[PDB]
């Protein structure tokens, strides 16, 4: 395939592929090599031609996943028959997971720059669609079955090494990228974009404990060359997040966006502080209140790792188990904070009630304390003779006794639900990020002098990978086929292109005379 | 079907249908199209005949919903062949659940007037029992496989919106109205008494939050408009409880009826002490003690809201899960009580042998406060020398470390039992609201001023309906068959009707043109 349909004809093929798992799977429950024969004519295309079959069957990947979309959309609309639609839209991913590990074993490039990655247009209603891809799509709408594919976790691993890169003429090809040749373009691919990203948090940690820790005398300190690069690469952080802010309007509101922001946000203050101590009011206040609020972002600055160590596997599983246990505290939250804005409202009426509003603060501060277990009725001894008790003591049943344990029991169900789906739901989160990959002097110094080594290692087995893609294409193979040398194949790996020939030769020479060093030893 | 049968000829096709589902379902374990005609033949009449076939066919959901109330009162008296029933009555909800969604293809208004909505009588014994309808009759047993059909929601979709309404000539009928064309008595809809109850909630939850924090001076306040606009609604809502409360005598006895009877009993104490200061002891204390019972009324008048907007899927689930850990936590609560009665006997006996009674308030606050883990030793520490010690601390064993633990147990236990079953108990709960709705001159102008715009929204909005029903009556369609304009469907939704069918011609125009501009894009 190299010309995409028209958005109606992709409608077209969608509504066959429709019509077909309704015909196939209806009831709650098959995926005979017929119904894949089915699936591969409801494209359309002479059965006579070739690549005119293949350019109407490009397509059958993002029209599977827009079934799936469609079926959600009906489980949402019909909420009594969501279990047939939701078993439809499993027998599509199932279909479609078949259909990718099929032409995984056909032929790989088609299966990754046609079916997986163009991205095409569909015209659901009138209106035009944006063009999405089948990675994309079955992303966004969490296909499990689809993400977990031979074929889509290779395409991801091709386009996380930047072996697969978007292409510059056209947004919506992905042409491949020739490595088996110090480019600097190579390290725009998402292994080494992440692996900086990673190694710029620990700097940027790096750097923020050696400024915190840095205050030794009351006076104004000597604004060192570590704290300037410091605030050099915490504005740079805000003005990239507020460029993306504004080109990017409200679909930059993830959490980890917000939490960064706010990370950000505070150190600027803290520079801001600091800016002015250093150019004066008084000079050592700025300075202890810049040190100050720049010593309440050290939660944010340690808890940022996390997000640059989604990759490693432990960390990313970690975050994944806490996405599904916050998803499902949003219960307890929401009850607390009805509980504790109704007893606020009745305490600061009995503030209200004698007269005067005196001890308002106090009232605010514990009862928020009684989440905490901390609260005590201290405060409300001198209040109102039954009615602070009264209300002091339901309001601790209900936070304590109830809602706390209820919080317990969000949590063990949550925990409960996702450590079966911890594999599956981490691989939608490396696709995602994957996905999400493929959309000054002093600190150009700073940055040089500290990413040296890292650029070194990453050249040295740039070099390997690119003898061992060298090694796979002179044989018939698919450039990520001998990385593993394994024990039950006598004939894999790269030793480094003869000497790895010569070690799979010694291999067979001594497999063979040792196997037939007894005549018996056969068949 | 015009006329209903005879109780006892409605018991007979009860008994059929029970020795059908007992013949065909005699194991733990079916419902062939055979058994379905089966069922269709166990009410009688001339099959010769038609309308008197349907006479007797109409009762078939009622008798199918008796008998799965009967196969629960089997699994009540035979407590060790419950399972035996339970499949039984399964058995039976599914046989219903297939029969609603075959007569909703055949035809729709049968299905909703005579099958589901028409209270048929039955004498269950020489007694003669009380008119029920099908859908009543599953909501009261909770017959989930029964109410997640799709004719059943349909028909409470339709009952909600108010398209069926409770005939006044005879109150076991529920004729149609006429929708097609701002009558007031469209506004006695559930939608509509159901949005108006949810905005005068909100309404009445803004009014005391006005009043409560309306206190300035210590002295007596100016009596605003406002705080006689919330009495007078508070006073409206206690007559209009305790009328119901006169007529419906403990069946009055819901929860929710009970706790909104607690908001406006304590709201009318603080009217009658402020009416009484207003016109007067110390009229200044008067005006406190009722501002601070008032106060106590805002956790009651801030949890009020979750009653009023069940209707919104996250507060109705989160009401239904809340019920659900309520409902296993029973037995931590009489556990609690019993223990806590004993150790309070323990306590007291205690404080009377030494031969006066003179720390027994301090007794119940503390062992009351141990719940809550706040419980301290000191007040017992000149007490009892061995004695007090011991009975506190194996109380504070018992409550804190076994029965808190259990409560927790008891928590995770419901919510992972209910959180699968969380769509179909709420929709049991939307099923009982919809079928819970169809069973002085100052207030007039505040609701007038107040619900203005929410009426001028209601009354496009139904216009909106009005037309989109005539469109669905120009067609042969069932009144509600294009409400989402869907993208699977190239004629579907209406526009605004001409413009819709220009719409649709140009949708089949431009998707006709498009698939045949290359004539292998075919089959
Ligand atoms: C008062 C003093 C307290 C100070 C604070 C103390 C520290 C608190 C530590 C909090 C850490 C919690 C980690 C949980 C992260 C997670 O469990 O997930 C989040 C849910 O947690 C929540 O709500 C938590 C609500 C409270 C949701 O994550 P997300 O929706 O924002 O999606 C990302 C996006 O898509 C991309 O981020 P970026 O690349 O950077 O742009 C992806 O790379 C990334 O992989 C994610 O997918
Ligand atoms: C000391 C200071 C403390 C002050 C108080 C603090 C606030 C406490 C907040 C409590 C809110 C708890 C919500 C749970 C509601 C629920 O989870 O459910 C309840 C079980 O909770 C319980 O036992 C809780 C026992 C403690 C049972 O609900 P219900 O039996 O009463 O049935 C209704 C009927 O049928 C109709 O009510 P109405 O239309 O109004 O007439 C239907 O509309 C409605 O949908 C229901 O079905
Ligand atoms: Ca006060
Ligand atoms: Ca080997
Ligand atoms: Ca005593
Ligand atoms: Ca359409």
Redesign the interface.
């Known amino acids: 395939g190299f010309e995409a349909?028209?958005?109606?004809?992709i409608?077209?093929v969608?509504?066959n592929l429709?019509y077909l798992i309704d015909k196939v799977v209806p009831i709650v429950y098959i995926l005979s090599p017929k119904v894949v024969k089915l699936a591969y004519?409801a494209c359309?295309?002479?059965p006579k031609?070739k690549a005119?079959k293949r350019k109407?069957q490009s397509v059958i990947i993002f029209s599977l996943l827009k079934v799936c979309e469609?079926y959600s959309?009906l489980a949402t609309?019909?909420?009594?028959?969501?279990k047939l639609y939701e078993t439809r839209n499993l027998a599509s991913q199932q279909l479609c997971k078949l259909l990718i590990e099929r032409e995984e074993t056909r032929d790989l490039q088609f299966l990754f720059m046609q079916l997986l990655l163009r991205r095409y247009v569909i015209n659901?209603?009138?209106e035009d669609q944006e063009p999405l891809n089948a990675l994309e799509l079955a992303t966004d709408m969490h296909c499990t079955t689809v993400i977990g594919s031979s074929g889509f976790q290779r395409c991801l691993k091709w386009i996380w090494r930047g072996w697969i890169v978007q292409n510059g003429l056209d947004p919506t090809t992905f042409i491949k990228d020739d490595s088996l040749a110090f480019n600097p373009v190579r390290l725009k691919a998402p292994v080494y974009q992440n692996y900086l990203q990673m190694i710029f948090s620990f700097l940027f940690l790096g750097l923020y404990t050696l400024v915190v820790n840095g205050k030794d005398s009351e006076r104004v300190q000597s604004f060192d060359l570590l704290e300037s690069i410091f605030y050099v690469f915490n504005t740079g952080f805000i003005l990239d997040e507020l460029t993306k802010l504004y080109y990017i309007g409200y679909a930059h509101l993830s959490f980890w966006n917000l939490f960064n922001d706010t990370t950000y946000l505070i150190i600027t203050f803290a520079m801001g502080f600091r800016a002015m101590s250093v150019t004066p009011y008084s000079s050592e206040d700025w300075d202890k209140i810049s040190y100050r609020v720049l010593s309440c972002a050290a939660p944010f600055v340690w808890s940022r790792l996390l997000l640059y160590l989604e990759s490693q596997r432990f960390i990313g599983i970690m975050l994944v188990i806490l996405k599904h246990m916050m998803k499902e505290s949003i219960?307890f939250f929401?009850?607390l904070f009805?509980?504790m804005?109704?007893?606020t409202?009745?305490?600061?009426?009995?503030d209200?009630?004698?007269?005067?509003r005196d001890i308002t603060g106090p009232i605010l501060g514990n009862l928020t304390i009684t989440v905490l277990?901390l609260?005590s009725?201290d405060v409300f001894e001198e209040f109102?003779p039954p009615?602070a008790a009264?209300?002091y003591?339901?309001?601790?049943?209900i936070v304590?006794?109830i809602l706390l344990?209820?919080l317990?029991?969000?949590y063990?169900?949550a925990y409960?639900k996702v450590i079966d789906n911890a594999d599956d739901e981490y691989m939608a989160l490396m696709s995602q990020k994957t996905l999400r990959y493929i959309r000054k002097d002093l600190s150009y110094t700073v940055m040089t002098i500290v990413y040296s080594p890292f650029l070194l290692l990453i050249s040295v087995k740039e070099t390997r990978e690119a003898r061992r893609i060298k090694y796979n294409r002179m044989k018939r193979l698919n450039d990520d086929a001998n990385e593993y040398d394994t024990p039950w194949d006598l004939t894999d790996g790269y030793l480094d292109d003869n000497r790895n020939s010569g070690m799979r030769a010694t291999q067979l020479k001594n497999s063979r005379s040792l196997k037939l060093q007894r005549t018996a030893e056969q068949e």
Chains 1, 2 share one sequence.
């Open positions: 349909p028209t958005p109606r004809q409608l077209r969608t509504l429709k004519e359309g295309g002479n031609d005119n109407y469609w959309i609309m019909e909420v009594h028959n969501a659901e209603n009138d219960v929401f009850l009805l509980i804005i109704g007893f409202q009745g305490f600061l009426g009995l209200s009630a004698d007269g005067k277990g609260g009725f109102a009615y009264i209300l003591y339901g309001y601790y049943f304590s006794v344990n209820i317990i029991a969000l063990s169900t409960q």
